[PDB]
Amino acid sequence: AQNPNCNIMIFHPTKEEFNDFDKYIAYMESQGAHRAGLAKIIPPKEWKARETYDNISEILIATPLQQVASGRAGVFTQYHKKKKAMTVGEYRHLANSKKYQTPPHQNFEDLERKYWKNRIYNSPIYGADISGSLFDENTKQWNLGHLGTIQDLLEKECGVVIEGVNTPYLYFGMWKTTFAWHTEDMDLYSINYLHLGEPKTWYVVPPEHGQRLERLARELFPGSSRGCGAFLRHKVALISPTVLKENGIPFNRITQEAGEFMVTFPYGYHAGFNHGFNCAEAINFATPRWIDYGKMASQCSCGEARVTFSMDAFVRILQPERYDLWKRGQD
Ligand SMILES: O=C(O)CNC(=O)C(=O)O
Ligand SMILES: [Mg+2]
Ligand code: NI
Ligand SMILES: [Zn+2]
Incomplete structure (x- = not known):
């Protein structure tokens, strides 16, 4: 079995290997990457996502969310308080303000x-x-x-x-x-x-x-x-690494830097935090190996998790027994 300790793997595809996305995912899995729940992919040096980021300031953040915590430092929940709209240029200035900016620090571990x-x-x-x-x-x-x-x-x-x-x-x-x-x-x-x-x-x-x-x-x-019965679908609970270690929960950690991709794998629980002003892009995707995970996925039916239009069909086809109750949660 590849990667039996479930370590986070880091990949450096060549430009040739970067052509076929599905094939590269399947390669990473052949090496055991999915066992960690998370992998890092460093793009080839020839690649770029776009030419510059110099003209993004007028993107609107219609509903910025203030993340208010409750609990203790290692075990807390957060709720999201909606704020007034602002542009990316306005948000960047806010992130760099004395109230919100990253403190001085020695290295990522100190931060x-x-x-x-x-x-x-x-x-x-x-x-x-x-x-x-x-x-x-x-x-x-x-x-x-x-x-x-x-x-x-x-x-x-x-x-x-x-x-x-x-x-x-x-x-x-x-x-x-x-x-x-x-x-x-x-x-x-x-x-x-x-x-x-x-x-x-x-x-x-x-x-x-x-x-x-x-x-x-x-x-x-x-x-x-x-x-x-699936309250982690509400996406509000935080547990620190120290608390995880005290309770014997297996986990790993890694820091992503600008220009890097991360892939999370089916049923890989993840959590994290930003170091300072940044912009990320993310999307869900599937492979053949996902289907069985989709069929077994838990679901929130209490009403809290409220999700996209497109999850309806996934529940309806992969989980027809759960469909009725889940849809009641959505309506
Ligand atoms: O970047 C974030 O805030 C959260 N992202 C993810 O959970 C992800 O890409 O799956
Ligand atoms: Mg713009
Ligand atoms: Ni995620
Ligand atoms: Zn729920």
């Missing part, structure tokens, strides 16, 4: 210590989940707006034609902006490209150990757990 010590005492503002793309239309390799769609993959594998679409999302971050512990919708893959700015630190639980994280989460968030 990580500071994040876990102090996150809860601040409420950073995240421009998340903005439909759109920063890839140039002429970028032909690993262009996250030109991937094969999940609907087409389901149709190729299973023969059933379904409605729905699959487009990317932009994320504008600042120091301490936080992504809570989650797997993707329908335990899909994700791919995330850090277009510019400061790093993003990731934490990940190997898919084979995801239920260990879930059991810890039910213990640490006991009211949430009574409310919903």
Whole structure:
């Protein structure tokens, strides 16, 4: 078995290897990358996502989200308070302000210590989940707006034609902006490209150990757990590396820098934080190997998780027994 300790793997494809996205994913999996839940892909030196980022300031962040925490430093939830719209240029200035900017630090490890010590005492503002793309239309390799769609993959594998679409999302971050512990919708893959700015630190639980994280989460968030049998689908709970280590939960960590891709694999729980002003682009995707994970994915039916139009068909076809209850949650 390849990668039996489930370490995060880092890949350096050549420009020739960067042509065929599906083939490269399957290569990485042949080497055991999926066992970690997360892999890093450094693009060939010849590649670029676009020519410059000099003209992005007029993108609108219609609903910036202030991430307010509750709990203790290593075990907390966050809720998202909606703020007034602002442009990317306005948000960048805000991220660089004395109130929100990255503190002085020695290295990524020192910054990580500071994040876990102090996150809860601040409420950073995240421009998340903005439909759109920063890839140039002429970028032909690993262009996250030109991937094969999940609907087409389901149709190729299973023969059933379904409605729905699959487009990317932009994320504008600042120091301490936080992504809570989650797997993707329908335990899909994700791919995330850090277009510019400061790093993003990731934490990940190997898919084979995801239920260990879930059991810890039910213990640490006991009211949430009574409310919903899949409350990590709400994407609000944080647990620090120190708490994970104290409870014996297998995990790994890695920092993504500008110009790098990360891939999350089916049922790979992940969480993390931004080091300073940045912009990322991410999208979900599928492969043949996903289908079985899609069929087994948990679902929130309490009403909190509320998701895209396109998840309907995935539930309806892959999980027809759950469909009725899940759809009640959506309506
Ligand atoms: O970058 C973020 O805030 C969150 N991204 C992801 O969870 C991802 O790409 O799957
Ligand atoms: Mg612009
Ligand atoms: Ni994710
Ligand atoms: Zn729920």
